[PDB]
């Protein structure tokens with residue numbers, strides 16, 4: 001292994017550790033593309049996990065400064081302040097591909113603001129959060145997953161990212177509540193007569209299920225609109241993106257099967273991921 005191979009292998013480790021779903025699908029990309037995905041994904045994870053290193057913004061600021069150095073001087077040698085392996089890999093990618101730097105900065109800004117989290121008043125605020133933490137990730141991946149990007153390409157990738165974040169929220173209601181976070185909006189909770197603390201204590205009820213299903217219907221519609229526009233992506237990436245999206249959306253059925261439990265994290269087992277691969281592979 002070369003030094004740079006070592007950097008990418010580490011990025012792969014971070015991706016596979018965090019998400020078996022996205023690693024299962026994106027590891028099927030041609031080598032140069034999967035490596036680029038690993039690096040971008042790893043940067044986004046490090047940003048997501050940054051505050052708890054010390055308990056403050058120090059590491060996040062270092063990551064931002066590193067990315068800024070890459071943007072301004074992609075062909076110069078940098079003494080990176082954050083995680084050198086990840087930044088070396090990102091810089092390698094940036095030397096070869098268009099990186100939407102402002103999308104990283106939007107992600108970083110969203111993570112900083114999350115320090116001062118208060119519940120979202122409206123769904124518009126929740127969806128703004130989904131953009132910041134996940135639509136941004138779609139935007140940064142866009143040039144890796146398409147041959148000739150247009151506004152449409154970014155729009156579809158951004159929509160997919162946001163759909164996936166809403167699925168993540170729908171899987172994690174219980175664990176998020178334990179961590180003093182509720183992502184359903186105050187308006188929708190009031191409309192549906194749902195109190196998450198009360199449901200965590202007492203179990204689901206029809207009010208909670210109707211609320212959960214309200215958001216699930218949004219994620220599902222967005223998913224279908226993405227599939228309908230899958231041809232924005234490169235021929236090689238199309239079945240891979242369909243696989244990633246389908247593996248993730250299968251989580252919704254897993255929640256339903258587990259009676260919407262707030263007390264464990266449901267999952268799509270590897271064998272079911274493979275079943276989805278076969279169903280897609282046969283279609284392509």
Ligand SMILES: O[C@]1(c2ccc(-c3ccccc3)cc2)CN2CCC1CC2
Pocket residue numbers: 019022044133134135137138139141157158160161162164165168241244
């Ligand atoms: O990191 C996320 C992600 C967001 C977006 C894409 C994407 C993949 C391909 C095309 C467009 C978007 C992948 C992963 C954001 N969030 C929910 C799911 C995972 C984990 C936390």
